DNA sequence: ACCTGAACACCGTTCAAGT
DNA sequence: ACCTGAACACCGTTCAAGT
């Protein structure tokens, strides 16, 4: 009997072992000894499946940050994210694609978490979303590039550029 | 007789008309009445072809910025980029993918152009590259999200956050 | 409910062979 | 030089039918 965490575990193993291009619905059915159209009972499509793989990826990226100042909130969040991504082959491409799809709920949670920190820094209520997104655009972009180069930090510099744009309200 | 600008013109028409998912080597050979393995004489692969399509996309995004202050340099560059991208279906996904591939020479030119502006603002010589990349991570991320939502600004807010992180040296 | 069989409509890339 | 034919080794998704 096949259950969703079966699937996500197996696809994660494919990602770690072979990269995001070898993560295909057919190959994933091959590692579970099932028919490719089996997976479509549990997931609506490869997008939803990859979003689940992103959530499983990022279970370790959520760190508690409420008893910390609004700069340590940001830095600590972004550090935890980047370290969750750098721990899986093409982790940052996968999570970035799920964020552009709309299929990782915890990447949305992390954007809420840093939106709170942007608020707590003085930006107006109507510009909070824009800011938080700004931050994650940066760290997703950065880790994609970084994981590229590695597979063939001064992360803090680019991040501090943003926390300074934020210092001014 | 088939020449590279033939190809790039035709693929651009496919992108405008149908989106980046319908831009496939086979479909592109179909619009040129050629065999799919014809395109592989002129381009090494779909990556190189898409980089060429990105360069043709971004011929309009280069604006002259040497007789302007280092904030108008940034704002003007980023405005020109975002407007070149928003003028083509999935323009920002295409250009973003070519930037992650390493196959648009003018996206590299734009990163040089804003690297100069970051220099001219006081950041150290060893942190210039990091900064410029930071900027384009932001505007590529932003326009991807924006073009998503449109197909189904407060750009300036996120950008000013960065030019303020930059004000401090 | 949950999965198989089998099809539908495609992909990128290569490469001998023709002109 | 530049292109065709034809193959190689794949894709995501659907859906009747079985259990």
Short mmCIF file of C-alpha atoms (C1' of nucleotides) in Angstrom, two decimals:
data_model
loop_
_atom_site.label_atom_id
_atom_site.label_comp_id
_atom_site.label_asym_id
_atom_site.label_seq_id
_atom_site.Cartn_x
_atom_site.Cartn_y
_atom_site.Cartn_z
CA UNK A 1 0.00 0.00 0.00
CA UNK A 2 1.48 3.27 -1.33
CA UNK A 3 1.15 6.45 0.74
CA UNK A 4 2.29 10.00 -0.01
CA UNK A 5 5.32 9.95 2.37
CA UNK A 6 6.49 6.76 0.61
CA UNK A 7 6.51 8.80 -2.59
CA UNK A 8 8.21 11.88 -1.15
CA UNK A 9 10.89 9.79 0.54
CA UNK A 10 11.66 7.92 -2.70
CA UNK A 11 11.74 11.08 -4.83
CA UNK A 12 14.00 12.75 -2.30
CA UNK A 13 16.36 9.81 -2.60
CA UNK A 14 16.33 10.27 -6.39
CA UNK A 15 17.10 13.98 -5.98
CA UNK A 16 20.00 13.39 -3.58
CA UNK A 17 21.42 10.58 -5.73
CA UNK A 18 20.93 11.84 -9.30
CA UNK A 19 19.70 15.46 -9.47
CA UNK A 20 16.52 17.27 -10.40
CA UNK A 21 16.64 16.23 -14.07
CA UNK A 22 16.47 12.52 -13.22
CA UNK A 23 13.47 13.24 -10.93
CA UNK A 24 10.72 12.27 -13.35
CA UNK A 25 7.32 10.70 -12.68
CA UNK A 26 8.36 7.66 -14.68
CA UNK A 27 11.69 7.18 -12.90
CA UNK A 28 9.93 7.74 -9.55
CA UNK A 29 7.38 5.03 -10.40
CA UNK A 30 10.32 2.81 -11.35
CA UNK A 31 11.93 3.13 -7.89
CA UNK A 32 8.60 2.31 -6.20
CA UNK A 33 7.74 -0.64 -8.53
CA UNK A 34 4.48 0.91 -9.66
CA UNK A 35 2.82 2.08 -12.89
CA UNK A 36 3.50 5.74 -13.76
CA UNK A 37 -0.23 6.44 -13.64
CA UNK A 38 -0.29 5.22 -10.07
CA UNK A 39 1.31 8.42 -8.82
CA UNK A 40 -1.56 10.43 -10.32
CA UNK A 41 -4.03 9.01 -7.77
CA UNK A 42 -2.05 10.64 -4.93
CA UNK A 43 -0.74 13.80 -6.65
CA UNK A 44 -2.49 15.94 -9.25
CA UNK A 45 0.71 16.34 -11.30
CA UNK A 46 4.50 16.63 -11.17
CA UNK A 47 4.14 20.20 -9.85
CA UNK A 48 2.19 19.12 -6.76
CA UNK A 49 4.63 16.23 -6.24
CA UNK A 50 7.61 18.59 -6.44
CA UNK A 51 5.95 20.95 -3.99
CA UNK A 52 5.65 18.06 -1.54
CA UNK A 53 9.31 17.29 -2.12
CA UNK A 54 10.10 20.93 -1.36
CA UNK A 55 8.12 20.83 1.90
CA UNK A 56 9.95 17.67 3.00
CA UNK A 57 13.19 19.41 2.01
CA UNK A 58 12.40 22.48 4.11
CA UNK A 59 11.11 20.80 7.27
CA UNK A 60 14.62 21.52 8.65
CA UNK A 61 14.72 25.16 7.45
CA UNK A 62 12.13 26.44 9.94
CA UNK A 63 13.90 27.82 13.00
CA UNK A 64 12.25 29.61 15.89
CA UNK A 65 12.87 33.35 15.85
CA UNK A 66 10.30 35.19 18.06
CA UNK A 67 12.63 35.96 21.01
CA UNK A 68 15.26 37.56 18.76
CA UNK A 69 15.82 40.99 17.27
CA UNK A 70 14.54 41.78 13.80
CA UNK A 71 17.99 41.52 12.22
CA UNK A 72 18.80 38.19 13.88
CA UNK A 73 15.33 37.09 12.74
CA UNK A 74 16.26 37.70 9.10
CA UNK A 75 19.87 36.46 9.19
CA UNK A 76 18.85 33.36 11.14
CA UNK A 77 15.94 32.54 8.82
CA UNK A 78 18.00 33.01 5.62
CA UNK A 79 20.94 31.02 7.06
CA UNK A 80 18.59 28.13 7.92
CA UNK A 81 16.98 28.19 4.46
CA UNK A 82 20.29 28.29 2.53
CA UNK A 83 21.59 25.43 4.68
CA UNK A 84 18.49 23.32 4.07
CA UNK A 85 18.92 23.92 0.33
CA UNK A 86 22.69 23.24 0.16
CA UNK A 87 22.08 19.81 1.74
CA UNK A 88 20.32 18.35 -1.29
CA UNK A 89 21.47 18.13 -4.91
CA UNK A 90 19.63 20.86 -6.81
CA UNK A 91 17.76 21.66 -3.59
CA UNK A 92 17.63 25.36 -4.50
CA UNK A 93 16.37 24.79 -8.04
CA UNK A 94 13.67 22.47 -6.71
CA UNK A 95 12.52 24.86 -3.97
CA UNK A 96 12.74 27.80 -6.35
CA UNK A 97 10.51 26.03 -8.90
CA UNK A 98 7.96 25.09 -6.21
CA UNK A 99 7.92 28.74 -5.08
CA UNK A 100 7.22 29.90 -8.64
CA UNK A 101 4.51 27.21 -8.93
CA UNK A 102 2.79 28.03 -5.65
CA UNK A 103 3.20 24.53 -4.26
CA UNK A 104 5.38 24.80 -1.16
CA UNK A 105 3.40 25.83 1.88
CA UNK A 106 6.49 26.24 4.07
CA UNK A 107 8.26 28.55 1.66
CA UNK A 108 5.14 30.67 2.12
CA UNK A 109 5.49 30.26 5.89
CA UNK A 110 9.10 31.48 5.68
CA UNK A 111 7.96 34.49 3.67
CA UNK A 112 5.42 35.22 6.41
CA UNK A 113 8.14 34.83 9.00
CA UNK A 114 10.36 37.37 7.39
CA UNK A 115 7.44 39.61 6.60
CA UNK A 116 6.88 39.84 10.31
CA UNK A 117 10.53 40.80 10.71
CA UNK A 118 10.23 43.46 8.05
CA UNK A 119 7.20 44.83 9.83
CA UNK A 120 9.01 44.80 13.13
CA UNK A 121 11.54 46.96 11.48
CA UNK A 122 9.34 49.83 10.54
CA UNK A 123 8.24 49.34 6.99
CA UNK A 124 4.63 50.21 6.35
CA UNK A 125 1.90 47.61 6.37
CA UNK A 126 1.32 47.84 2.62
CA UNK A 127 4.95 47.22 1.75
CA UNK A 128 5.57 44.24 3.94
CA UNK A 129 4.83 41.59 1.40
CA UNK A 130 7.01 43.23 -1.18
CA UNK A 131 9.90 43.28 1.19
CA UNK A 132 9.71 39.70 2.37
CA UNK A 133 9.49 38.52 -1.24
CA UNK A 134 12.56 40.69 -1.98
CA UNK A 135 14.52 38.83 0.67
CA UNK A 136 13.61 35.38 -0.65
CA UNK A 137 14.18 36.36 -4.29
CA UNK A 138 17.70 37.17 -3.16
CA UNK A 139 18.44 34.01 -1.19
CA UNK A 140 16.84 31.65 -3.75
CA UNK A 141 18.75 33.33 -6.60
CA UNK A 142 21.98 33.24 -4.62
CA UNK A 143 21.77 29.60 -3.62
CA UNK A 144 20.85 28.54 -7.15
CA UNK A 145 24.03 30.20 -8.44
CA UNK A 146 26.09 28.90 -5.51
CA UNK A 147 24.87 25.30 -5.87
CA UNK A 148 25.54 25.46 -9.62
CA UNK A 149 29.16 26.49 -9.05
CA UNK A 150 29.67 23.93 -6.24
CA UNK A 151 28.30 21.03 -8.29
CA UNK A 152 30.88 21.74 -11.05
CA UNK A 153 29.67 32.83 2.81
CA UNK A 154 29.63 36.30 1.15
CA UNK A 155 25.99 35.41 1.17
CA UNK A 156 26.11 37.63 4.28
CA UNK A 157 27.21 40.63 2.19
CA UNK A 158 24.19 40.58 -0.12
CA UNK A 159 21.93 39.89 2.84
CA UNK A 160 23.26 42.84 4.86
CA UNK A 161 22.69 45.09 1.84
CA UNK A 162 18.98 44.28 2.32
CA UNK A 163 18.91 44.62 6.09
CA UNK A 164 20.40 48.10 5.52
CA UNK A 165 17.83 49.00 2.84
CA UNK A 166 15.46 47.96 5.66
CA UNK A 167 17.10 50.02 8.44
CA UNK A 168 15.68 53.10 6.77
CA UNK A 169 11.94 52.65 7.26
CA UNK B 1 19.48 28.73 -46.55
CA UNK B 2 18.96 28.79 -42.76
CA UNK B 3 20.95 31.27 -40.65
CA UNK B 4 20.98 31.81 -36.88
CA UNK B 5 18.88 35.03 -36.91
CA UNK B 6 16.23 33.13 -38.92
CA UNK B 7 16.10 30.70 -36.01
CA UNK B 8 16.05 33.31 -33.24
CA UNK B 9 13.35 35.32 -34.99
CA UNK B 10 11.13 32.24 -35.41
CA UNK B 11 11.63 31.05 -31.82
CA UNK B 12 10.87 34.53 -30.55
CA UNK B 13 7.62 34.43 -32.49
CA UNK B 14 6.82 31.09 -30.83
CA UNK B 15 7.56 32.58 -27.40
CA UNK B 16 5.38 35.65 -27.97
CA UNK B 17 2.54 33.57 -29.43
CA UNK B 18 2.49 30.45 -27.23
CA UNK B 19 4.83 30.68 -24.22
CA UNK B 20 8.09 29.11 -23.11
CA UNK B 21 6.64 25.59 -22.81
CA UNK B 22 5.70 25.46 -26.50
CA UNK B 23 9.25 26.63 -27.39
CA UNK B 24 10.73 23.23 -28.20
CA UNK B 25 13.39 22.28 -30.74
CA UNK B 26 10.85 20.14 -32.55
CA UNK B 27 8.15 22.83 -32.70
CA UNK B 28 10.81 25.37 -33.77
CA UNK B 29 11.92 23.08 -36.61
CA UNK B 30 8.24 22.76 -37.54
CA UNK B 31 7.82 26.54 -37.97
CA UNK B 32 10.96 26.70 -40.14
CA UNK B 33 10.07 23.61 -42.28
CA UNK B 34 13.24 21.78 -41.36
CA UNK B 35 14.30 18.53 -39.67
CA UNK B 36 14.76 18.81 -35.88
CA UNK B 37 18.39 17.75 -36.27
CA UNK B 38 18.95 20.69 -38.57
CA UNK B 39 18.98 23.12 -35.66
CA UNK B 40 21.88 21.18 -34.10
CA UNK B 41 24.26 22.29 -36.88
CA UNK B 42 23.81 25.95 -35.82
CA UNK B 43 23.30 25.57 -32.04
CA UNK B 44 24.95 23.07 -29.71
CA UNK B 45 21.68 22.45 -27.82
CA UNK B 46 18.43 23.98 -26.60
CA UNK B 47 20.37 25.86 -23.90
CA UNK B 48 22.55 27.72 -26.41
CA UNK B 49 19.47 28.40 -28.56
CA UNK B 50 17.59 29.83 -25.57
CA UNK B 51 20.57 31.99 -24.68
CA UNK B 52 20.45 33.44 -28.19
CA UNK B 53 16.73 34.05 -27.73
CA UNK B 54 17.53 35.85 -24.48
CA UNK B 55 20.13 38.08 -26.17
CA UNK B 56 17.65 39.00 -28.91
CA UNK B 57 15.11 39.66 -26.15
CA UNK B 58 17.46 41.97 -24.27
CA UNK B 59 18.85 44.00 -27.18
CA UNK B 60 16.32 46.66 -26.05
CA UNK B 61 17.21 46.44 -22.33
CA UNK B 62 20.64 48.06 -22.68
CA UNK B 63 20.36 51.78 -21.97
CA UNK B 64 23.24 54.22 -21.74
CA UNK B 65 24.01 55.25 -18.17
CA UNK B 66 27.55 56.75 -17.91
CA UNK B 67 26.51 60.43 -17.58
CA UNK B 68 24.13 59.70 -14.69
CA UNK B 69 24.46 59.32 -10.94
CA UNK B 70 24.98 55.90 -9.41
CA UNK B 71 21.37 55.64 -8.22
CA UNK B 72 19.90 56.68 -11.57
CA UNK B 73 22.32 54.16 -13.11
CA UNK B 74 20.74 51.33 -11.10
CA UNK B 75 17.09 52.41 -11.31
CA UNK B 76 17.40 53.11 -15.03
CA UNK B 77 19.11 49.79 -15.78
CA UNK B 78 16.59 47.73 -13.75
CA UNK B 79 13.63 49.63 -15.26
CA UNK B 80 14.93 48.92 -18.78
CA UNK B 81 15.48 45.22 -18.00
CA UNK B 82 12.04 44.68 -16.41
CA UNK B 83 10.42 46.44 -19.36
CA UNK B 84 12.29 44.30 -21.89
CA UNK B 85 11.13 41.20 -20.00
CA UNK B 86 7.47 42.24 -19.56
CA UNK B 87 7.21 42.67 -23.36
CA UNK B 88 7.46 38.96 -24.15
CA UNK B 89 5.40 36.05 -22.84
CA UNK B 90 7.52 34.29 -20.22
CA UNK B 91 10.33 36.72 -21.06
CA UNK B 92 11.53 36.69 -17.44
CA UNK B 93 11.53 32.91 -17.11
CA UNK B 94 13.47 32.62 -20.37
CA UNK B 95 16.07 35.24 -19.42
CA UNK B 96 16.30 33.83 -15.91
CA UNK B 97 16.99 30.31 -17.24
CA UNK B 98 19.65 31.63 -19.67
CA UNK B 99 21.28 33.47 -16.74
CA UNK B 100 21.39 30.26 -14.70
CA UNK B 101 22.78 28.42 -17.75
CA UNK B 102 25.48 30.96 -18.54
CA UNK B 103 24.23 31.58 -22.07
CA UNK B 104 23.19 35.23 -22.28
CA UNK B 105 26.13 37.50 -22.87
CA UNK B 106 24.09 40.69 -22.41
CA UNK B 107 22.69 39.66 -19.05
CA UNK B 108 26.36 39.44 -18.10
CA UNK B 109 26.89 42.89 -19.63
CA UNK B 110 24.04 44.27 -17.50
CA UNK B 111 25.61 42.71 -14.41
CA UNK B 112 28.86 44.46 -15.33
CA UNK B 113 26.97 47.69 -15.81
CA UNK B 114 25.46 47.60 -12.39
CA UNK B 115 28.67 46.35 -10.88
CA UNK B 116 30.23 49.57 -12.04
CA UNK B 117 27.40 51.45 -10.34
CA UNK B 118 27.92 49.53 -7.13
CA UNK B 119 31.60 50.38 -7.27
CA UNK B 120 30.83 54.00 -7.91
CA UNK B 121 28.90 53.91 -4.74
CA UNK B 122 31.65 52.91 -2.41
CA UNK B 123 31.53 49.19 -1.98
CA UNK B 124 34.90 47.52 -1.92
CA UNK B 125 36.43 45.98 -5.00
CA UNK B 126 36.04 42.42 -3.72
CA UNK B 127 32.33 42.79 -3.03
CA UNK B 128 31.29 44.32 -6.29
CA UNK B 129 30.35 41.15 -8.05
CA UNK B 130 28.30 39.96 -5.14
CA UNK B 131 26.35 43.15 -5.12
CA UNK B 132 25.55 43.35 -8.79
CA UNK B 133 24.38 39.73 -8.73
CA UNK B 134 22.20 40.64 -5.71
CA UNK B 135 20.48 43.32 -7.75
CA UNK B 136 19.72 41.02 -10.69
CA UNK B 137 18.60 38.15 -8.45
CA UNK B 138 16.03 40.61 -7.16
CA UNK B 139 14.76 41.94 -10.48
CA UNK B 140 14.68 38.51 -12.19
CA UNK B 141 12.82 36.99 -9.23
CA UNK B 142 10.41 39.92 -9.11
CA UNK B 143 9.56 39.92 -12.80
CA UNK B 144 9.08 36.15 -12.83
CA UNK B 145 6.48 36.50 -10.06
CA UNK B 146 4.95 39.59 -11.67
CA UNK B 147 4.66 38.02 -15.14
CA UNK B 148 3.13 34.90 -13.57
CA UNK B 149 0.40 36.94 -11.87
CA UNK B 150 -0.23 39.08 -14.99
CA UNK B 151 -0.58 36.07 -17.30
CA UNK B 152 -3.36 34.66 -15.06
CA UNK B 153 5.33 49.30 -9.91
CA UNK B 154 6.16 48.57 -6.23
CA UNK B 155 9.11 47.09 -8.00
CA UNK B 156 10.61 50.45 -6.98
CA UNK B 157 10.15 49.63 -3.29
CA UNK B 158 12.23 46.46 -3.36
CA UNK B 159 14.79 48.17 -5.56
CA UNK B 160 15.18 51.14 -3.20
CA UNK B 161 15.70 48.71 -0.32
CA UNK B 162 18.86 47.65 -2.19
CA UNK B 163 20.04 51.11 -3.14
CA UNK B 164 19.80 51.92 0.59
CA UNK B 165 21.72 48.77 1.61
CA UNK B 166 24.21 50.25 -0.88
CA UNK B 167 24.20 53.82 0.49
CA UNK B 168 26.14 52.50 3.47
CA UNK B 169 29.46 51.51 1.91
"C1'" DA C 1 -10.20 2.83 -3.17
"C1'" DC C 2 -6.08 2.05 -5.36
"C1'" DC C 3 -3.48 0.29 -9.10
"C1'" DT C 4 -2.37 -1.82 -14.14
"C1'" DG C 5 -2.22 -1.66 -19.20
"C1'" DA C 6 -1.89 0.62 -22.73
"C1'" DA C 7 -2.26 4.28 -25.22
"C1'" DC C 8 -1.84 9.56 -26.60
"C1'" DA C 9 0.86 13.05 -27.94
"C1'" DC C 10 4.90 14.46 -27.37
"C1'" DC C 11 10.34 15.41 -25.96
"C1'" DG C 12 16.21 16.40 -26.84
"C1'" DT C 13 20.00 14.61 -29.35
"C1'" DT C 14 22.81 11.89 -32.64
"C1'" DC C 15 24.47 10.49 -36.86
"C1'" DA C 16 24.96 7.98 -41.17
"C1'" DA C 17 23.75 9.32 -45.48
"C1'" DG C 18 22.62 12.40 -49.11
"C1'" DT C 19 23.29 17.05 -51.83
"C1'" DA D 1 28.79 22.86 -45.63
"C1'" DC D 2 24.25 22.17 -44.53
"C1'" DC D 3 20.30 19.31 -44.20
"C1'" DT D 4 17.23 14.66 -44.15
"C1'" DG D 5 15.82 10.16 -42.30
"C1'" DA D 6 15.41 7.60 -38.97
"C1'" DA D 7 16.39 6.03 -34.93
"C1'" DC D 8 17.53 6.13 -29.58
"C1'" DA D 9 16.00 6.67 -25.26
"C1'" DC D 10 13.03 8.95 -23.11
"C1'" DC D 11 8.86 12.38 -21.28
"C1'" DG D 12 3.72 13.90 -18.55
"C1'" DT D 13 -0.97 12.58 -18.35
"C1'" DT D 14 -5.33 9.97 -18.98
"C1'" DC D 15 -8.43 6.43 -18.42
"C1'" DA D 16 -10.90 2.13 -19.14
"C1'" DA D 17 -10.47 -1.91 -16.82
"C1'" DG D 18 -9.31 -4.90 -13.12
"C1'" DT D 19 -8.97 -6.08 -7.84
#
